[PDB]
Design a protein around this nucleic acid. Structure first.
Ligand SMILES: [Mg+2]
Ligand SMILES: [Mg+2]
Lengths: 1208, 115, 114
DNA sequence: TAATTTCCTAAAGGACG
DNA sequence: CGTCCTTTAGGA
RNA sequence: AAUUUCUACUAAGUGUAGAUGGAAAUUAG
């Protein structure tokens, strides 16, 4: 058997097919003359308004009831989290206290003030009339009468606010875990520096403007958490933190602003308080965007006043303290150090030098774990002072002058691009096009918005966390009061890109009702009389049928007869949630009709003693079992319809097993006959709207392979579909408006030779025998229908998948591995490997080879993406041009997925995907981060029900029997080291490693000084020119060298084999041995003495060791590309293998299936695959009980030892 | 009068422009997409005699698809790829790149560009 | 007041009629030879707004091969076949097949004639 | 934009005409 | 007494 | 350059090859 043979039928799934509804006959005219269209359209246009009024009343309710809450268990929990719990089995009673707190807050909500007259029908009929005094407002709520039950979706989106499930969408988890945690944190931060803040500078105003009683100090203290739970209390909390308004434009200082004011020492490095959480521009027209633009971003605006205030403030920049400027470390310092000096991370290099002096000893080898800890601590250390930039600068350079000058020159750039563009800023500017299509105006807003947004990003580093201690002050006052005014232009930027990238279509729609709040409940037998929605099958062409309101029983008295026309009809209702359904039907005034007062069963249901809270008793649970099993046995609505072939008395050792059995058996859809002429007459008379469900595989012309969704909708009524794929209810109906107006369509003409846009399409020009339009489907008022299907509602093979893959793979002897990775010349490079490490196939995915009918026509994507990026280069507006690259990439990742799902069943493998939580990659690779994260979400949710269309539906792999070889995707941070078959692996030391040796360049070979270079040379062992191999052998020991802790052999023989590629940006190819001969004879050293380390530590000029360090680094590159030509790249090894020949990629690109990787990218995929092969080797070492806890996140030294032990 | 027929010869030059546009539209369709010439686009009609090429209100991008409207047969043009929604009614073939417009490309230059 | 402006209108109508025949030439080439309609060929610009249908001087036969000139871009038209060698540059379709000219063929009725 | 929920229901209760 | 909404009930 | 919808198209003529889970609410950026 296979491994994927076992992985079937694991768990449940909810997919929404959707389809287009074609009106058949005069039914569209029936909707028109019956005056049925505008009714839902006006109903779906005040539904938001009555929902807003209802949320207004609900906020009134919460404002009423939060002023009467009292959490009595606060007094102990404020101590017990201030215990430093150390677990020791003490935190679980701590969690019981917390669940008591989040329960006891709900008791005021769910207990009192009605609360059944809060979500029932009574609210919009009685209370919201009283809760409103304007006639127009009551006119809205008096319209939805009779249609109250439509809000059951909204009410079920309301009742999650009041629950206790530790979901974020409660109020309980808000006011405990998002409120008390920050409360006690800010309380402890308040209690540490409480003696900092005095009376006569902040307290004398905050005692009277905020509260005028209980002034300040009790707030963080203890028992004032029971006030901050409301919106006005957290508003006072924010006014303490952010600063009050006092109804005027003074905007006086707050307490966190007083820690931004306590700056008179100039040594900050201490945290502030934190704000708290609380629950419950364009895009209208073109001239409104123009109004917003030239009225909120003219030079007359306050934002430009903030700019001029910043200009005069930075005119006074050097007249303050040169130590009171903190700048926040992060992504910013790499550009900060590059704009002051011109080098990338020399301030990081200066701090790294200083921390090398502080914490590392006087020994000549850095620990690589100390390097990783130094990286994580440099990311941990908050900010650096401007005096620390004075000490990191050399002599004759104070750093404040360059910041002042470049800031003034950048706002001068803003000034100059404003003055060159003031021709638009006349407020009576008249447009000429739609700005979606216009280009001359969009570029101006672009170049101004980019200047002001780039300066905003240029000054976003200059905060240092904001809530910091001692610093400089009077710079920072005008700084923050100009920055708060400035920052709204970026929200304007995000708004205008949400207008220039508007859709040409319109996906506005609304919910169809047909005068029925019970519209489209579910597919059923008897409830056709209420939901008024039945599916009719004819030939292979389907129909939905809606009758009307006042003829609601027109689908009853229809028979077979044989008039040579007979639509079929689908029936056999479900049984939704029998664990809640059978008590709903069996104790609800039905017990008296069928039974009497036994009572014994009534008491054990009354205790709930068949659930947990008691284990069970074989009388206690099984009295329920036979009571249900025999009360069903006389129910005439179901017992004739369903065969309840049940298991015996001893199989049901719980209650969930029988409930799962009736969940399995309760859905038996089949055909009912209804002849054609009378139902067509019923359509003709106007009693039955008959739509046709349609997609582009239902037509007679569609002879290709159908859509996967159409395959599901065909399989829904197969005779092989037993209970696997059920067509559950909850379907809806939506109509989109025709938006491409008929004076605005474009259309290719008929019988005209139209050209082909695919370059590899061998037929070069096509003729069409009729008309084809552009986006015709938006030019028609079109109905669309959504049906929810439920796939695998009752599974059998139930187990945890992450354990199962491991216990399967341990028993496996040759597990294949597919590894995917990113790159530059290729977007994704597939490798696939065996259990030994032997490569079995590899290729690039720049071309996707679509195949049909035995003919395969390859589709390049990289040259297409090059065309679109070449358009973005000469784009002149860069907003319609950069969104389409993003959508093309999310139109490209949707075709690699079929190749991956083909390869998985082809090779029984697992997949190894490059992680993106723990790596800062090269920022030059093509498929960037927001596309790769989108890719992994589209490989998990396809592997959830993996199905290949061209297979037998009955067999395994088919659409009745998809493999479910992963779990559900959760979140972009919850993707950690295992999910199904998808392994996440980090991508460290993965590109720059030869696959025949396992060698790595690990040194730090750029020049700083002569004696350090001589230290480097004396750390070498042998530097002797071998004459018959005509190279220079470099025997070195990694124990001699710094930061080389991670290696395994630590004894390598480097060489000058082959040529390299120097950057110089220019391009420079250099052959290495001749370059070394030139550098030696340029400086005159006889280099035939074998070891000559003493000879190389005798030169005393900088111009040699600056020139030798570059060549020594360029010996070890193995990443030799031009990035101007896709064909010219190679990865080459400076190390002999176990035989003694080297590895050149040029020897292996021109081979059928090379036993080494072909290109520099295939090396990356192959080394991702080797880590999963090491994990396979790890899986056999442990045992079947510990296999669920094997650590996979492989540290570097283990990986290097695996890599060097690979070739033996 | 001297400002009346010059309110009329302006209607003669549009009859010239539309013939130039239709003559262009029958030759762009006959090209592969990597051989499409850079054009200058606008929605006002553009005279290929003068053009006032120094005007800063016009760029020089490639031409994508050549299509036709629905009710009339007026040949709109797509600049760049399809999904840009850049519909335009008047193009003039040039040889200059995006902002430095060198000269106006002539008809036989486009005709020979097919090869 | 009518001295040189006649030459202006004389040119404007020629630009109009050449716009019309260059609207027509592509639809002409996209027709099969058994559907090639009947023309009022003149090698003289004959205004499609009136058609001047009183004169029976114009012969009415079936149009043949639609070649392009090599010197200019002009739509040269042949009547019958190549074997007649009748090189004409101005045609308008009607339903006036043999010599009996009744009604005008407009553009949507030569497009739908395909 | 991303995280996080609820639903993916037939049948009793009843208001009313 | 249909008819037409409202509410409803909680497996491991 | 057609589409339930997106993406590439024309792929042999009203289409092809892949994918697609919707409706609503709330929070944070
Ligand atoms: Mg298909
Ligand atoms: Mg498209």
């Amino acid at each position: 058997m296979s491994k994927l043979e076992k992985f079937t039928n694991c768990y449940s799934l909810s997919k929404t097919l959707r389809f287009k509804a074609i009106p058949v006959g005069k039914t569209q005219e029936n909707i028109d003359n019956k005056r049925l269209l505008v009714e839902d359209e006006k109903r779906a246009e005040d539904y938001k308004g009555v929902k807003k009024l209802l949320d207004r009343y609900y906020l009134s309710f919460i404002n009423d009831v939060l002023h009467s809450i009292k959490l009595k268990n606060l007094n102990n929990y404020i101590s017990l989290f201030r215990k430093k719990t150390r677990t020791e089995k003490e935190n679980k009673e701590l969690e019981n206290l917390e669940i008591n707190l989040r329960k006891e807050i709900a008791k005021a909500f769910k207990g009192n003030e009605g609360y059944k007259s809060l979500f029932k029908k009574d609210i919009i009929e009685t209370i919201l009339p009283e809760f409103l005094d304007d006639k127009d407002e009551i006119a809205l709520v008096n319209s939805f009468n009779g249609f109250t039950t439509a809000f059951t979706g909204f009410f079920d989106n309301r009742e999650n606010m009041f629950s206790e499930e530790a979901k974020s969408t409660s109020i309980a988890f808000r006011c405990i875990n998002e409120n008390l945690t920050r409360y006690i944190s800010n309380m402890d931060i308040f209690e540490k520096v409480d003696a900092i803040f005095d009376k006569h500078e902040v307290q004398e105003i905050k005692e009277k403007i905020l509260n005028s009683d209980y002034d300040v100090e009790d707030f963080f203290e203890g028992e004032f958490f029971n006030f901050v739970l409301t919106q006005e209390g957290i508003d006072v909390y924010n006014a303490i933190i952010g600063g009050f308004v006092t109804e005027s434009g003074e905007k006086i200082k707050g307490l966190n602003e007083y820690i931004n004011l306590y700056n008179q020492k100039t040594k900050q490095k201490l945290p502030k308080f934190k704000p708290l959480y609380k629950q419950v521009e364009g895009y209208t027209s073109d001239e409104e965007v123009l109004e917003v633009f030239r009225n909120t971003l003219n030079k007359n605006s306050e934002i430009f006043s903030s700019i001029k205030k910043l200009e005069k403030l930075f005119k006074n920049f050097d007249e303050y303290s040169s130590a009171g400027i903190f700048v926040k470390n992060g992504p910013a310092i790499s550009t900060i150090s590059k704009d002051i000096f011109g080098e990338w991370n020399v301030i990081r290099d200066k701090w790294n030098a200083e921390y090398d002096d502080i914490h590392l000893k006087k020994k000549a080898v850095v620990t690589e774990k100390y390097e990783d800890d130094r990286r994580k601590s440099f990311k941990k250390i908050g900010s650096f002072s401007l005096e620390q930039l004075q000490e990191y600068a050399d002599a004759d350079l104070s750093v404040v002058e360059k910041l002042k000058e470049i800031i003034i020159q950048k706002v001068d750039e803003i000034y100059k691009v404003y003055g060159s563009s003031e021709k638009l800023f006349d407020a009576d500017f008249v447009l000429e096009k739609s700005l979606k299509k216009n280009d001359a105006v969009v570029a101006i807003m672009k170049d101004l918005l980019d200047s002001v947004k780039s300066f905003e990003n240029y000054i976003k580093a200059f905060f240092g966390e904001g809530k910091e201690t001692n610093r400089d002050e009077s710079f920072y006052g005008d700084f923050v009061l100009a920055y708060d005014i400035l920052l709204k232009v970026d929200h304007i930027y995000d708004a205008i890109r949400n207008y220039v990238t508007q859709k040409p279509y319109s996906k506005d729609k609304f919910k169809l009702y047909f005068q029925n709040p019970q519209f489209m409940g579910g597919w059923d037998k008897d409830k056709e009389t209420d939901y008024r929605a039945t599916i009719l099958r004819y030939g292979s062409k389907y129909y939905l049928a809606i009758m009307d309101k006042k003829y609601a029983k027109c689908l009853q008295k229809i028979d077979k007869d044989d008039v040579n026309g007979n639509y079929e009809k689908i029936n056999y209702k479900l049984l939704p949630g029998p664990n809640k359904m059978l008590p709903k039907v069996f104790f609800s005034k039905k017990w008296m009709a069928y039974y009497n007062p036994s009572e014994d069963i009534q008491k054990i249901y009354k205790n709930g003693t068949f659930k947990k809270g008691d284990m069970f008793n074989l009388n206690d649970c099984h009295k329920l079992i036979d009571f249900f099993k025999d009360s069903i046995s006389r129910y005439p609505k179901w017992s004739n319809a369903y065969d309840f072939n049940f298991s015996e008395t001893e199989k049901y050792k719980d209650i969930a097993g029988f409930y799962r059995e009736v969940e399995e058996q309760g859905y038996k859809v089949s055909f009912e006959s209804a002849s054609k002429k009378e139902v067509d007459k019923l359509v003709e008379e106007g009693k039955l709207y008959m739509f046709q469900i349609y997609n582009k595989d239902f037509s007679d012309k569609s002879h290709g392979t159908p859509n996967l969704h159409t395959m599901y909708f065909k399989l829904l009524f197969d005779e092989n579909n037993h209970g696997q794929i059920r067509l559950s209810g909850g379907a809806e109906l939506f109509m989109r408006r025709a938006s491409l107006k008929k004076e605005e369509l474009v259309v290719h003409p008929a019988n005209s030779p139209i050209a082909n846009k695919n370059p590899d399409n061998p037929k070069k020009t096509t003729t069409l025998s009729y008309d084809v339009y552009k986006d015709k489907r938006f030019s028609e008022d079109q109905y669309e229908l959504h049906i929810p299907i439920a796939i695998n509602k009752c599974p059998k093979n139930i187990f945890k998948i992450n354990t199962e893959v491991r216990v399967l793979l341990k028993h496996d002897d040759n597990p294949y591995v597919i590894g995917i990775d990113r790159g530059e010349r290729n977007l994704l490079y597939i490798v696939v490997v065996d259990g030994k490490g032997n490569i079995v196939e590899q290729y690039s995915l720049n071309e996707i080879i679509n195949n049909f009918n035995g003919i395969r026509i390859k589709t390049d994507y990289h040259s297409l993406l090059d065309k679109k990026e070449k358009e973005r280069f000469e784009a002149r507006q860069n907003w319609t041009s950069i969104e389409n690259i993003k959508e093309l990439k999310a139109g490209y990742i949707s075709q690699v997925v079929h190749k991956i799902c083909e390869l998985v069943e082809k090779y029984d493998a697992v997949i190894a995907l490059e992680d993106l939580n723990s790596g800062f990659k090269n920022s030059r690779v093509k498929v960037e981060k927001q596309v790769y994260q989108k890719f992994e979400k589209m490989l998990i949710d396809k592997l959830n029900y993996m199905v290949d269309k061209k297979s037998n539906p009955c067999a395994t792999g088919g659409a009745l029997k998809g493999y479910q070889i992963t779990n559900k995707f959760e979140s972009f941070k919850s993707m950690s080291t295992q999910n199904g078959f998808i392994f996440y692996i980090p991508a460290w030391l993965t590109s720059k490693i030869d696959p025949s040796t396992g060698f790595v360049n690990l040194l730090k070979t750029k020049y700083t000084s002569i004696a350090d270079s001589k230290k480097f040379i004396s750390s070498f062992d042998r530097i002797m020119y071998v004459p018959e191999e005509d190279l220079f052998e470099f025997a070195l020991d990694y124990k001699n060298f710094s930061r080389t802790d991670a290696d395994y052999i630590k004894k390598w023989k480097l060489y000058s084999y082959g040529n390299r590629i120097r950057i110089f940006f220019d391009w420079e190819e250099v052959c290495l041995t001749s370059a070394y001969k030139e550098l030696f004879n340029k400086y005159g050293i006889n280099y035939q003495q074998g070891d000559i380390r003493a000879l190389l530590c005798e030169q005393s000029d900088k111009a040699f060791y600056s020139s030798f360090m570059a060549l020594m680094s360029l010996m070890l590159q193995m990443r030799n590309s031009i990035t101007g030509r896709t064909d010219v790249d190679f990865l080459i090894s400076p190390v002999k293998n176990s035989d003694g020949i080297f590895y050149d990629s040029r020897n292996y690109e021109a081979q059928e299936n090379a036993i080494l990787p072909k290109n520099a990218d295939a090396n990356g995929a192959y080394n991702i695959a080797r880590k999963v092969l090491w994990a396979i080797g790890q899986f056999k070492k442990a045992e079947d009980e510990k296999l669920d806890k094997v650590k996979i996140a492989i540290s570097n030294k283990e990986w290097l030892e695996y890599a060097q032990t690979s070739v033996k | 009068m001297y400002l009346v027929v010059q309110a009329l010869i302006r209607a003669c030059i549009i009859k010239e422009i539309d013939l130039y546009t239709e003559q262009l539209y029958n030759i762009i369709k006959s090209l592969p997409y990597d051989k499409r010439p850079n054009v200058v686009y606008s929605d006002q009609p553009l005279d290929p005699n003068n053009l006032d090429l120094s005007e800063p209100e016009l760029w020089a991008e490639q031409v994508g698809e050549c299509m036709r409207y629905a009710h009339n047969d007026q040949p709109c043009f797509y600049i760049g790829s399809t999904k840009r929604e850049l519909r335009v009614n008047y193009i003039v073939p040039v040889i200059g790149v995006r902002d430095e417009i060198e000269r106006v490309m002539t008809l036989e230059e486009v005709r020979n560009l097919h090869k």
